[PDB]
Design a protein around this ligand. Structure first.
Ligand SMILES: [Zn+2]
Lengths: 67, 213, 25, 136, 101
RNA sequence: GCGCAAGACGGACCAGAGCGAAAGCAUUUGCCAAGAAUGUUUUCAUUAAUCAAGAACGAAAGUCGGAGGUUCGAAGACGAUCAGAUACCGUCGUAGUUCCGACCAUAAACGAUGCCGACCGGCGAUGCGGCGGCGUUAUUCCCAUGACCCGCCGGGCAGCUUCCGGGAAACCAAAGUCUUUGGGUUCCGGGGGGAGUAUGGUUGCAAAGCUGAAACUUAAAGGAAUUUGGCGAAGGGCACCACC
RNA sequence: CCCAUGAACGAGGAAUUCCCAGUAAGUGCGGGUCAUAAGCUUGCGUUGAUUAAGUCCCUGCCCUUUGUACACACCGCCCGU
RNA sequence: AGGUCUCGUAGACCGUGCACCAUGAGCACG
């Protein structure tokens, strides 16, 4: 990479199904505080409520399958 | 033993005056090592360029062939060699439940240029059309093909290469074909698929001077 | 035993018997 | 050896021919004329195993090596010429092409127009194998 | 016994259909019998599209697509999970499955 | 990357679409010749379908003469796989695969359903020709033309439903109109093997093709469709004696 | 029961077991065995957590569909020299 | 004159592929 990128905050909206081979990961619809328009899908680990605020490092990538 | 990039040069290629931006890239060649010269080895090169890298804001999926045949030092001047289309556009235009019409015309310009004009053509489903087929009869296809043949052999023999290269930059021949063949079958997707150049005249340097302006 | 190779072997046996008959006479 | 004019905001353009089969990955970088190559690396250059010649990891290693090489040479803008094995064989590109392209982009390099230039035939000769095919 | 109303193909008034080669295999399968796959994809899909998006010299540059057509032998079609098998009453559904994803 | 030379093949458009008696037929253009269907208040007036002898055509492979050998590739050579491979796999590779003429007449040549003709439900689309009727377009006015829409007619490739009916059932607008058994007319089958074998005739350069038994042996060999079964078949569900 | 003797053991490879709330774990006390008798088992009580409110990846089980020349039911039937 | 237009959500594939299968000694009872 060799690039700098600021930490961008996030906020979940609706919980989705739980992906992963053993069901470890979880899909969730997650949305940014400072950019109200755009909303992406990210793979999260751990128990998530239905509206808690989340901290995200990279906002470029998108969620996928277990692979 | 020695690094091969020490005895190298750098040269600039020039688009002809029919285009807008004369700078399209740079190439490199070795020095005049021994008896051989670096002038002829820089000659036989084909420079594939896109239309958007030459003009400002137009169709960007048109490709052009440029070939050099004269050098004077730290500079190269090109010439038209052919016109092609990108593969993704060609694969995107073809689809099921429609007909494809293709023809090729061998034409000779006012100069010593034996070109070869290709074409495509695809019929259009109407807006209120319920039928999923939208095919055409064979004689309708023959008439449309003959119309394309006479249109593409109408506009080349009476005029030179420069203004027909100027005419090839926008959609002119395809729009003329689509306007002409509207009564036979309302096709919508007309393009000149490929332009191939077969014969070269005797090369003289004044044409390359006045071609680039 | 499918019929194709059985017919092939029987054809070979018939050819052997016929060519033995023509070497005998 | 280097670009003579100063690059303030502009860039120089070469082409990079990626050729990805199902058992090898070629990264070949050539000038805009198409005749004069500058440096080439293959998937067998960066691994001592004949089976991992078409690998995402070998593609990343080859892409990083060729990106570094054209970085000291002085080319920073690349045109991608992607290619499969073509011909009468399959037309789907190998899995190492995407990883090689991503690793070439991750090195800090500017690209231009990308396309596929695989040699698709109209109708070629008979395919390799029998009528019943390569059954296993 | 008779399995289908047709004979696994679409030949109704022809007798001979120009055979084609398989993609994974090299079987000489007739054209109307082989399962045809037409997939529309692009060069990069999710793992490198943003990485190209902030590494391109042209802004708003749409990625070109790749268009290929695949011919599958029946054994290769079952083995690659392209087509499955249904019950007796559910075999006579000529509609394609709903392509949600 | 630039050209040159040779041979093969015409993708994507390509369809439960078209033509042909059947094998079969896909770059453009030109020439010759043939044909279905549609239309007809044109002509002849019973000239009609089936057909033993006889005759033409007939996929691939195989044979006989030569510049053609690009690719692919029976036999053969090599390396692995394996307990054992002269099999699955990989690299070369002869004869062929290509053309011109002379041969043979065999396929799951299958819609596993001879040909002509009459009758007996509906529906929605497809291809050809003809007919009728609002509207749009080849820009704005008027005609017919091509494209589109709404119906109808005749022939054809086909699709969905059923107490019309049939069938052992799969299924069938034909495989229906059959004990309430007769429209006309060719070929062909009599348990399973032996056996498409022996012999004879016939055709062919050959390979083989057609015609085609007996002795002996056997109580079964077979066709549809249900219930757990068994899949190195595909899914779905459950479990801290499974996992995270 | 009393006094001396004071070894290995420095948190253990491959592999593997048990467990979602007064639970695991630490801790002691009863009963069985008993003339003499608990490093076992069954009950009782004290202190008292980390993690999770899912998955079919592994290990097994169950169901549906499909194929069958198998029905003493694949440890089945079965071809040839 | 305002500055972050409003509402709801599958948008999920993508170096992923597997060798090694020979044989079944038989089989009740009314
Ligand atoms: Zn295959």
């Amino acid at each position: 990479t060799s690039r700098v990128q600021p930490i961008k905050l996030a906020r979940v909206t609706k919980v989705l199904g739980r992906t992963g081979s053993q069901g470890q990961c979880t899909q969730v619809r997650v949305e940014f505080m400072d950019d109200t328009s755009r909303s992406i899908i990210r793979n999260v680990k751990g128990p998530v409520r239905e509206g808690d605020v989340l901290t995200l490092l990279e906002s470029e990538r998108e969620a996928r399958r277990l692979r | 033993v020695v690094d091969p990039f020490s005895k190298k040069d750098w040269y600039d290629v020039k688009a002809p005056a029919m285009f807008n931006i004369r700078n399209i890239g740079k190439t490199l060649v070795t020095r005049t090592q021994g008896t051989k010269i670096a002038s002829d080895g820089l000659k036989g090169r084909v420079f594939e360029v896109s239309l958007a890298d030459l003009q400002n804001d137009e169709v960007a999926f048109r490709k052009f062939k440029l070939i050099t045949e004269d050098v004077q030092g730290k500079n190269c001047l090109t010439n038209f060699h052919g016109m092609d289309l990108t593969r993704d556009k060609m694969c995107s235009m073809v689809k099921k439940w429609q007909t494809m019409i293709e023809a090729h015309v061998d034409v000779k310009t006012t100069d010593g240029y034996l070109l070869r004009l290709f074409c495509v053509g695809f019929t259009k489903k109407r807006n209120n059309q319920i039928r999923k087929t939208s095919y055409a009869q064979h004689q309708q296809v023959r008439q449309i093909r003959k119309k394309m043949m006479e249109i593409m052999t109408r506009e080349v023999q009476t005029n030179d290469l420069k203004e027909v290269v100027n005419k090839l930059i926008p959609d002119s021949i395809g729009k003329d074909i689509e306007k002409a063949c509207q009564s036979i079958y309302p096709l919508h997707d007309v393009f000149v698929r490929k332009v191939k150049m077969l014969k070269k005249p005797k090369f003289e340097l004044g044409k390359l001077m006045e071609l680039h302006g | 035993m499918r019929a194709k190779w059985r017919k092939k072997r029987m054809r070979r046996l018939k050819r052997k018997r016929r060519k033995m008959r023509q070497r005998s006479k | 050896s280097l670009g003579p004019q100063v690059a303030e905001g502009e860039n120089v353009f070469g082409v990079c021919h990626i050729f990805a089969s199902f058992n090898d990955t070629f990264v070949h970088v050539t000038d805009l004329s198409g005749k004069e190559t500058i440096c080439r690396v293959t998937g067998g250059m960066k691994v001592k195993a004949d089976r991992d010649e078409s690998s995402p990891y070998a593609a990343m290693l080859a892409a990083q090596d060729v990106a570094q090489r054209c970085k000291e040479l002085g080319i920073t803008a690349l045109h991608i010429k992607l290619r499969a094995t073509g011909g009468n064989r399959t037309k789907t590109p190998g899995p190492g092409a995407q990883s090689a392209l991503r690793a070439l982009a991750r090195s800090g390099m500017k690209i231009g127009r990308i396309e596929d230039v695989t040699p698709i035939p109209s109708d070629s000769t008979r395919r390799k194998g029998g009528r019943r095919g390569r059954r296993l | 016994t008779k399995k289908r109303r047709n004979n696994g193909r679409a030949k109704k008034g022809r007798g001979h259909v120009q055979p084609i080669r398989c993609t994974n295999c090299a079987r000489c399968v007739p054209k109307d019998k082989a399962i045809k796959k037409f997939v529309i994809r692009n060069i990069v899909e999710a793992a490198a599209v943003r990485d190209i998006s902030e590494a391109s010299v042209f802004d708003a540059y749409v990625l070109p697509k790749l268009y290929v057509k695949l011919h599958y032998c029946v054994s290769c079609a079952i083995h690659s999970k392209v087509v499955r098998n249904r019950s007796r009453e559910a075999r006579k559904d000529r509609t394609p499955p709903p392509r949600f994803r």
